[PDB]
Write a protein that holds these residues in place. Structure first.
Motif: not given
Lengths: 170, 171, 170, 171
Positions: C1-2, C44-46, C67, C125-127, D2, D114-115, D118-119, D122, D143, D159-162
């Protein structure tokens, strides 16, 4: 490296169930519709295409202007061109099912076919969209350890030569 | 492989909106300023550059001594060299916008251009900085599935032939 | 994950060579300039940021609205806050150089610091783009098998927890 | 992993240009048509959907029987629900354009949105199709470093989170 393998739209021999290799059949109206639908999904990467009409037309309707390469052609079935799959001699059917030991008179051997396809793939120098045929898509998928059957007008993206990225069937 | 591609500083044809291919224009005052800002912002890696003046000068002002390769040149627009984008025939505009089926009289086809650029990149043995042109950066970014337009005097780093790593623009 | 690890712009203690942890120093004019330059490079990622002023201001000038998380703070040097690196007792210097066995009076242990940082990273949980500090960037780079020293106002992108993607030093 | 994300079919507020969050609008005739076109174009995988009418209806017409999760809902615009994008205060327009620092009175902040999203992602244990909203697809695509705007009734596979795998739009 990202490669999109696109199986051309349907021709009459698809519904008829006949071996279609170098016989240059045109797309049916439905095949053209399948090609147009791909325009809204395929990425705008450098494009290549089998020089056979059905592949070239699929590329055109999908919004591409491909570089033509005979290496992307389906296998040459020789005397078996147009033969009904249903009535194919057991030996031929078995060979095509196992993907080995197939060399029809006047055509190409499955081994020569694969040599041709993989030589082309290894020569690619950047990601690309490849308009091709069922046998070619099957050879690539099998090389990656996956079942290689895909519907006409569909595509599969692969991270060559590692794994399949995603399948697109409409 | 990590490669940093740099779009040369601006020339007069950037503000004028004319197709700039093999026409050997010099950098404008601002173009040289853009090149100077790159010094210290690019990694210390072996460097290569298009042999055209604007690219070589950008490389020099950025603090590099690149090996020159015509293979890094912008596409050859042929008879369209110097043509105003505004007045370009629809067929050509469309071809350039969609980056496909472009073959100007007396010039290079987009297919030949891509083959040239990608063959050069394939031959690179290790990470490097490449001083080149807008069309070259565009071909690379588009092949990686992204919008390929970047500002003059800006850079992009990619892990070739897999993904874009970063886009760098300075003010 | 980036994940993009961004070291905040310079403060006066950078040129002075003093340990800067939880002491809430502001950015210098040059530090602000370094932050503004990042606006033209960071994706522009979170965004997340240490709650310390220098990190928050770097995020703001780089065009982000992060955040805030105290877990992204530099290590608390305790009584060593503001101490000149040059005159640090050999034991402390050696520990900071080897990145182990450092627990200043009134501060955090290097082990507790790493626990805090990695707990935060594993929770993502995300980039994301993370505005943080030198010690945090160093801890992450070392975890990936790389030298962890990076200049103020610079960044490093990583494919967590596999490898470094690219370094951005202006 | 996926994941296929589907933006629900159009509602009246799409053509009107009004912020559509938790306001439970129905699909327009064309919106239902868009949903029907998705049937057969999406993979046969477990499905999840926002509990809002427009999403549930899209899932149904697309041939799925999804488990409902409010977590897949569009962001709650609060007092801005129904507001014309055109007349939105600059601070809000900017916040939404740059996708940052957005916290409408009586609604959800972009950070909380977003939280939430994304939660939920996940927690997914295996590949699935998610019937959701424009803002959710946007959060995911952004993201992953890409432009996040997609047409109503369209889908994207990631292909989460890539990385993003494909974008699918039908006419």
């Amino acid at each position: 490296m990202e490669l999109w393998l696109v199986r051309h739209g349907e021709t009459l021999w698809n519904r008829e169930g006949r071996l279609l290799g170098w016989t240059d059949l045109p797309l049916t109206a439905e095949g053209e519709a399948q090609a147009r639908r791909l325009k809204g999904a395929l990425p705008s990467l450098p494009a290549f295409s089998s020089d056979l009409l059905r592949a070239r037309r699929t590329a055109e309707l999908a919004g591409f202007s491909p570089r033509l390469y005979p290496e992307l052609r389906e296998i040459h079935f020789g005397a078996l061109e147009g033969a009904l799959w249903e009535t194919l001699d057991p030996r031929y059917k078995e060979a095509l099912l196992r993907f080995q030991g197939f060399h029809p008179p006047g055509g190409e051997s499955l081994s020569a076919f694969q040599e041709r396809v993989f030589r082309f793939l290894e020569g690619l120098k950047a990601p690309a969209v490849l308009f091709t045929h069922g046998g070619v898509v099957r050879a690539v998928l099998r090389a990656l350890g996956e079942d290689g059957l895909v519907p006409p007008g569909s595509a599969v993206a692969v991270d060559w030569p590692r794994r399949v990225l995603v399948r697109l069937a409409l």
